[PDB]
């Protein structure tokens, strides 16, 4: 029988979500199973669990981000440049591969959305505006990004049936790790500035593998390796949300662990 909002809220409380919390979810809706009113039921449950003083931050990205189409070029290729839609945060759908729940999060009334078209983050709650801006090209997941502020805001990572590769906040550890050989990428995004499309080309850390040995197309990347080690080494609340095995992780702790993990393995 499909899970009700009330059942999910009680499960989230059992896992350790408290009123006032700052939560970043990563969700496998297949693992959760049928919901009374579809994915919105779980969105509503998350909002209720964090309460009117809590916040939700999600890495939603953009369905039509021209990442692969501009990757490695010093400017967008001509055909891309002429016709690609500018990123419009009010209308641009979420990237389906990071979870079908994210389109429901980003369309929730009052949700705020960050300006980085490829790394776009959505936030709900009183601190949403502070979470989502600034989010500049060249600062996808590291210092000055919404992830940085999430880590300073007592953030908890709520993994609902998601794998250890799903932990976006660990890209902050990659960004700041004092290690040799870090990979960078160059890509271009079409932004709206005063109503006009402006192409911006930037470089940033490679979020598909910070070192060559972590950059196989189907990983494991460093995020996955760090998170697997961390979860083998740390007490973390575990329990069901819907039908999904779930975990509630202290974000600052896992990121600090990840910085140490990288720096212990790779020369400066």
Ligand X SMILES: CN[C@@H]1[C@@H](O)[C@@H](O[C@@H]2[C@@H](O)[C@H](O[C@H]3OC(CN)=CC[C@H]3N)[C@@H](N)C[C@H]2N)OC[C@]1(C)O
Task: Tell whether residue 171 is among the known ligand binding residues.
Answer: yes
Q: Which of 26, 105, 221, 244 binds ligand X (CB under 6 A)?
A: 221
Within residues 22-61, the interface with ligand X by CB under 6 A covers 61
Task: Tell whether residue 118 is among the known ligand binding residues.
Answer: no
Minimum Å gap between C-beta 150 and ligand X is 16
Task: Tell whether residue 28 is among the known ligand binding residues.
Answer: yes
Judge whether 54 and 125 are in contact, CB under 8 Å.
yes
Q: Which of 11, 21, 44, 67 binds ligand X (CB under 6 A)?
A: 67
Judge whether 11 and 240 are in contact, CB under 8 Å.
yes
Question: Which of residues 28 and 65 has its CB atom nearest to ligand X in the complex?
Answer: 65
Name the strands in the sheet holding 121-124, side by side, starting at the edge strand that comes first in the sequence.
Answer: 112-113, 121-124, 55-59, 22-27, 156-160, 244-250, 237-241
Q: Which of 216, 217, 226, 215 is nearest to 170 (CA)?
A: 226
Within residues 114-143, the interface with ligand X by CB under 6 A covers 118
Q: Is 69 among the residues that bind ligand X (CB under 6 A)?
A: no
How big is the CA angle at 96 (ends 91 and 101), to the nearest 5 degrees?
85
Within residues 165-194, the interface with ligand X by CB under 6 A covers 165
Question: Which of residues 95 and 257 has its CB atom nearest to ligand X in the complex?
Answer: 95
How big is the CA angle at 261 (ends 260 and 266), to the nearest 5 degrees?
100
Consecutive H or E run containing 147: helix 146-151
Interface with ligand X (CB under 6 A): 61, 65, 67-68, 95, 118, 165, 207-209, 218-219, 221, 223
Bind-site residues for acetyl-CoA: 26-30, 100, 168, 171
């Amino acid at each position: 029988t499909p899970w009700s909002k009330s059942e999910l809220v009680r499960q989230l409380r059992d896992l350790g979500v408290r009123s006032g919390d700052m939560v970043m979810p990563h969700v496998s809706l297949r693992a959760v199973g049928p919901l009374a009113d579809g994915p919105q039921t779980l969105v509503d449950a998350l909002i209720e669990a964090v309460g009117p003083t809590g916040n939700i931050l999600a890495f939603v990205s953009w369905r039509d981000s021209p990442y692969e189409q501009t990757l490695g070029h010093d400017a967008p290729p001509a055909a891309i440049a002429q016709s690609w839609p500018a990123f419009d945060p009010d209308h641009a759908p979420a990237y389906p591969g990071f979870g079908a729940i994210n389109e429901f999060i980003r369309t929730y009334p009052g949700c705020r959305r960050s300006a980085h078209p490829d790394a776009s983050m959505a936030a709900i709650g009183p601190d949403a505006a502070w979470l989502v801006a600034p989010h500049e090209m060249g600062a996808a997941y590291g210092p000055r990004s919404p992830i940085a502020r999430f880590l300073a805001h007592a953030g908890k990572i709520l993994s609902i049936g998601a794998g250890p590769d799903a932990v976006t906040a660990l890209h902050y550890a990659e960004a700041v790790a004092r290690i040799e050989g870090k990979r960078r990428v160059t890509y271009s995004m079409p932004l709206l500035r005063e109503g006009k499309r402006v192409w911006v080309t930037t470089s940033d850390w490679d979020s598909n593998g910070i070192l060559d040995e972590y950059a196989a197309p189907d990983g494991p990347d460093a995020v996955e390796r760090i998170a697997r080690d961390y979860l083998a080494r740390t007490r973390v609340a575990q329990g069901p949300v819907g039908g999904a095995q779930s975990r509630l992780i202290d974000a600052a702790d896992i990121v600090s662990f990840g910085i140490e993990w990288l720096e212990a393995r790779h020369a400066a």
